[PDB]
Amino acid sequence: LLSVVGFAVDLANVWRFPYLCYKNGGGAFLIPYTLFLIIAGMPLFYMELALGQYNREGAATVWKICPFFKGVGYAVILIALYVGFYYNVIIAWSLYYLFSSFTLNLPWTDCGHTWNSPNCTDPKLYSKYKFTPAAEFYERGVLHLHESSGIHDIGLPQWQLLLCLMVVVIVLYFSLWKGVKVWITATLPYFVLFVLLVHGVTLPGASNGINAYLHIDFYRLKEATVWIDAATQIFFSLGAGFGVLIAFASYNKFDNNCYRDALLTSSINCITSFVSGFAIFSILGYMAHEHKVNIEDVATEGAGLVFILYPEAISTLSGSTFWAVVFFVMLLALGLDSSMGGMEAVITGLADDFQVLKRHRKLFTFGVTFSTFLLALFCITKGGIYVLTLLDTFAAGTSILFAVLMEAIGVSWFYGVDRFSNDIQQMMGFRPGLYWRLCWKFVSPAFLLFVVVVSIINFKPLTYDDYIFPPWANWVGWGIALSSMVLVPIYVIYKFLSTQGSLWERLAYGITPENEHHLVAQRDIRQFQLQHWLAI
Ligand SMILES: *[C@@H]1O[C@H](CO)[C@@H](O)[C@H](O)[C@H]1NC(C)=O
């Protein structure tokens, strides 16, 4: 139970799920989330865990089972880097909020400070939500967003955010430069969410919030963005698609039970997400009651909802300083562990691939943490929330859905879901079952392909709150998405143009596992027969 709750909650469930829910309503986002967690989330979580635990390799080198698909591991490592770029910036925000939380008069309470606009209006004394003292502290006091007109005109990095990001990358380096990889980081998210839930239900005007949460709008389900949001958040919360699961299972015992691991992680994720949305909407209803505004336009739908929503919940608690310090220490440590997991996925994959990097661990981890620092300097600029939004919507998006779709395809169709079931039976001692095989070979790939094509053809232009990104920003975002999606066909063409022989024996050498290339020469290969593909 401790092992599954330690990683069942991460920075995703606590930071990204609130604004993805609020942006898409109440249960209107919890319906696709649960359907994808049961249909595609849990099966592919269990598939990645079993793959890593059996093959004993990272994300990139696990594809010695089907060599044409190593581009998928390269893609997930690139996605992990891209996501760490702004995870470190979220941790910088957590550090700045924790540092600001060490006073009796919390800064996000009144409008009497130096960062406040002349239009800062607090209820204690039909407006907009950017004129509340909490949103004024987030935008004008932390981000300094008021000094940039858009993603074209981003300023220089923010000094305080620069120091916070330096501290983050330094602690990450000193946490990863020897460690091949705890009670508080695993128990405190749930305790904080429990306190949040109970104090939210006791708040005035939060019943309107929980009703707006429990009201499921099906016209939102008839459109396509809620499903893309739910799929991407499923793969963020569970960690499938960043190479973290395969890298972490590479170190698990051979007899370890990935079935029970996946089951507990997925069930705890579903319950945690439901109660997380419940508490988030309790606070949002309280804010709509306090600010005399509608619930649908009471806060931002960007990445900074938590840093506006949770400070306002804290300011209502008794002993606001203690609870602010506790919540932001929790957020700091949680996102810190998440970013450590991502960077360790990157390092483990690229070190299992190239041994010159496995022998040189300190230099490689310095190069990894120092590349994620220079490219996170863009997200701590004055217009860095626009770059962070671009990355958040494009780094892991259609890209991660495509990567996980190709993982499913390469494990189920080309390697064999029957071979995978035999390997799983060899690890644990029991066959997966019919539901798991039908989801691995047919249900999850079909749902993921549908979500990918719908994510491409139902693309809405990128926006911040009321800021329409220029078209070139959308082109740059699609370049960010394609930079990892093209690794799969590029590597297929590279592996085909680097193997001697005729067409069919090149194909055979590229779809046969590396350890039994002996049988390729004697022409006894499974995938060239029909009984391999008709196995359901
Ligand atoms: C913001 O304050 C400025 C002060 O000159 C002025 O534009 C107005 O009072 C406020 N703007 C809006 C849109 O309320």
Swiss-Prot record:
What happens when you mutate Y87F? Severely decreased norepinephrine uptake
The regulatory note on its activity is: Inhibited by mazindol, desipramine, nomifensine and nortriptyline.
Q: Name one GO biological process term.
A: neurotransmitter transport
| GO MF annotations in UniProt | actin binding; alpha-tubulin binding; beta-tubulin binding; dopamine:sodium symporter activity; metal ion binding; monoamine transmembrane transporter activity; neurotransmitter transmembrane transporter activity; neurotransmitter:sodium symporter activity
Sequence ranges on the Cytoplasmic membrane side: 52-70, 179-181, 252-257, 348-362, 412-441, 489-536
Disulfide-linked positions: C111-C120
Recorded consequence of changing D10N: Abolishes norepinephrine uptake
User: What, per the annotation, is the impact of changing V244A?
Assistant: Decreased norepinephrine uptake
Q: In the UniProt annotation, what is the result of changing F236A?
A: Loss of norepinephrine binding
Provide the effect of G342A: Loss of norepinephrine binding. Abolishes norepinephrine uptake
Tell me the residue numbers annotated for binding Na(+) 2: A8, N13, S237, N269
Phenotype upon changing W472A: Decreased homodimerization and norepinephrine transport
The UniProt annotation places (R)-noradrenaline 2 binding at Y22, K23, E301
* Residue ranges annotated as Extracellular topological domain: 24-27, 102-157, 202-225, 282-321, 384, 465-467
Q: Which InterPro entries match?
A: Na/ntran_symport, Na/ntran_symport_noradrenaline, SNS_sf
Look up what happens after changing D10A.
Loss of norepinephrine binding. Abolishes norepinephrine uptake
Q: How does it sit in the membrane?
A: Multi-pass membrane protein
Q: What other note does the entry give for this protein?
A: This protein is the target of psychomotor stimulants such as amphetamines or cocaine.
Q: How does it assemble?
A: Monomer. Can form homodimers in the cell membrane; homodimerization is mostly mediated by cholesterol and lipids, and regulates neurotransmitter transport activity. Interacts with PRKCABP.
Q: Which family does it belong to?
A: Belongs to the sodium:neurotransmitter symporter (SNF) (TC 2.A.22) family. SLC6A2 subfamily.
Q: What is this protein called?
A: Sodium-dependent noradrenaline transporter
Give the gene symbol: SLC6A2
